[PDB]
Amino acid sequence: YNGYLCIAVAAGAGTGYFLFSWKK
């Protein structure tokens, strides 16, 4: 049930904490 698309990248991006996503 909806387990892909913007999931791998998301989880992959936000795998750790935030990363560049919320670059300091």
At which residue do the structure tokens 């919320």 appear? 22
| Structure-token pair, residue 19 | 């990363």
Q: How far is CA 20 from the centre of its chain?
A: 11
Other beta carbons within 10 Å of 13: 13
Collect contacts of 6-14 with beta carbons under 8 A, ≥24 apart.
Answer: none
Amino acid letter at 4?
Y
Q: What is the DSSP letter of 21?
A: G
Identity of residue 8: A
Q: How was this structure determined?
A: NMR
Sign of the CA dihedral running 13, 15, 22, 10: positive
